[PDB]
Amino acid sequence: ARQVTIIGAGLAGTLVARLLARNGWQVNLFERRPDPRIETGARGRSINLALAERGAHALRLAGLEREVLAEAVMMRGRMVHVPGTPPNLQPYGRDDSEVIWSINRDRLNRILLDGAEAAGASIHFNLGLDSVDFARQRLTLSNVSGERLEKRFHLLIGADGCNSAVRQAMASVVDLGEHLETQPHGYKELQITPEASAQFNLEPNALHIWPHGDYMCIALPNLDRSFTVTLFLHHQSPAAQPASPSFAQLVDGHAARRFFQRQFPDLSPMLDSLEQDFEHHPTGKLATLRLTTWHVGGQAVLLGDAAHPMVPFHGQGMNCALEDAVALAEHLQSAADNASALAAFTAQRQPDALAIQAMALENYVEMSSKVASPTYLLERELGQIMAQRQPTRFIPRYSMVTFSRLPYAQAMARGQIQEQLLKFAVANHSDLTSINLDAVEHEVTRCLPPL
Ligand SMILES: Cc1cc2nc3c(=O)[nH]c(=O)nc-3n(C[C@H](O)[C@H](O)[C@H](O)COP(=O)(O)OP(=O)(O)OC[C@H]3O[C@@H](n4cnc5c(N)ncnc54)[C@H](O)[C@@H]3O)c2cc1C
């Protein structure tokens, strides 16, 4: 049996562990955190994640989808809260079968942990990777107290998150060609209690958006009718716009409350613990880190956030991470050797990672800056018309990334053709009546091969 060592029992690591273990691999998985299935007296604070077709399919191949969806809240559409109009529900896709699932991060991790152990993988918690000696095929682990433990390894899988230790150790033997691109937006995670959401009639079966240009909020529901709310806001105010809102201006909960009362008046009543959550939770940072290569020979390979950290604006980090796990397991299982597997895995997935990394950055301007634009509404109306006339040619880019498994590079390449197509057809036209629908349909068939 081929042996594999996996660092990080996160989402990608536990999935790939399951897939290799049921294929007969001797799988050992190391995790720095304690086992979350051991119940303690601590009050865990977990957030919800948007599970889409890519992630759902990855769980389907692993035999875990039914179990995960049983604990997920169905989101049938996007609930846009734009001032001046009532909350507007925008259904997903074309039919009632296209939905996104809101799954609690902790619930999902437990299901994957159980899933990996049932396939035969061994999971070792409370052990963080410190360094790798690639020459001697050894690594060093330690607990929080710093007691060191050495282990032999044949194949090392880095599934240890944005701040991957496998990635850092790989940087000693190969130039990964890393380019960190930091994001000026930070995020703050707030809570809406079940009582609060019910009191203000917040739809449980929808994903909510409060667009506001350079800042915004999103909310995803949990099984108990609570919601986890993410505020996206500039870390600092630029000198060009010194009075623009930023986290630096929100020094306490009293400032945060006045900010929300003025800029999110319908959302602020639902934030019972806005003052407490604002000062007791850290302001998270966002970044896009790109790598030229993801592997060292047949010795080590990165996947998930370890290989391609991205901004969460498209809700696709986990989905891409689960998709990575399937591809990595497929290549490892069927290749002539580990080095051929790892080189082929990188070649297949690296272009798609750069694509979803790019599309995630663009999608912030789409959901927070465009959903209230007059030109964008006409382009969106015309794009929906093309999705019905050519259902296999004009698939809106959000549907391709979210509701299909088309490679991220194809979705971005087809999306730029559609974006430019809508841009030129709507240009210099006020109403949809002055737009020639059949000329737009002709260019759809000319430039977009059917799927
Ligand atoms: C605010 C926010 C919202 C998001 N929302 C969504 C969403 O709606 N949909 C979506 O698809 N994605 C979303 N994402 C992205 C998603 O959470 C991540 O992309 C996903 O968790 C990546 O999975 P992974 O297994 O690669 O890493 P992780 O899931 O982070 O797992 C990494 C694991 O490695 C462990 N580890 C780290 N260092 C070490 C070490 N040195 N030794 C041992 N173990 C180690 C960690 O403890 C952890 O268990 C969001 C991200 C953020 C920040």
Side-chain angles (χ1 to χ4, degrees), residues 25-223:
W25 289 67
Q26 178 193 99
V27 182
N28 285 98
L29 170 60
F30 292 88
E31 167 61 42
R32 176 177 61 185
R33 300 178 179 194
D35 188 347
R37 298 160 302 171
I38 302 175
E39 215 172 339
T40 68
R43 312 286 209 187
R45 295 292 188 92
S46 189
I47 60 110
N48 303 284
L49 300 172
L51 181 70
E53 172 55 27
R54 296 179 191 270
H57 169 90
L59 301 164
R60 201 175 303 119
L61 294 176
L64 294 179
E65 185 191 28
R66 191 168 76 106
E67 192 180 1
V68 173
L69 296 192
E71 290 183 39
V73 175
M74 186 190 297
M75 300 189 292
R76 296 182 158 276
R78 215 171 54 157
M79 189 71 75
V80 181
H81 299 253
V82 48
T85 74
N88 175 41
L89 175 66
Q90 304 169 1
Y92 283 139
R94 302 185 300 112
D95 58 16
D96 288 53
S97 151
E98 303 224 317
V99 292
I100 297 311
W101 303 96
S102 174
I103 174 59
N104 187 251
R105 187 189 295 266
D106 190 65
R107 292 178 176 277
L108 177 61
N109 199 41
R110 300 196 311 253
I111 291 173
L112 292 174
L113 289 174
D114 284 351
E117 291 179 338
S122 291
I123 319 179
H124 313 280
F125 296 92
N126 303 290
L127 287 167
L129 181 65
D130 293 337
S131 54
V132 179
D133 190 330
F134 287 91
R136 307 197 183 187
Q137 318 169 38
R138 308 182 64 75
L139 46 84
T140 306
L141 306 144
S142 59
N143 51 27
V144 66
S145 70
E147 309 186 7
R148 271 164 57 183
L149 172 64
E150 288 196 350
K151 297 286 188 181
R152 158 74 186 271
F153 76 91
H154 294 74
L155 171 68
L156 184 56
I157 294 182
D160 44 341
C162 288
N163 288 286
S164 161
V166 182
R167 184 176 73 236
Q168 190 179 35
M170 285 174 58
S172 64
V173 296
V174 298
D175 179 11
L176 298 169
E178 322 188 54
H179 174 259
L180 184 72
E181 179 183 354
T182 44
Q183 177 75 10
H185 281 93
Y187 70 94
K188 178 84 65 178
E189 288 172 353
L190 311 167
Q191 197 68 24
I192 300 182
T193 67
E195 297 78 12
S197 75
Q199 178 185 353
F200 297 97
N201 296 285
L202 197 62
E203 172 58 49
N205 283 123
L207 189 155
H208 297 255
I209 301 185
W210 291 260
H212 207 132
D214 287 352
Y215 47 101
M216 70 164 186
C217 287
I218 61 173
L220 279 72
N222 203 338
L223 293 168

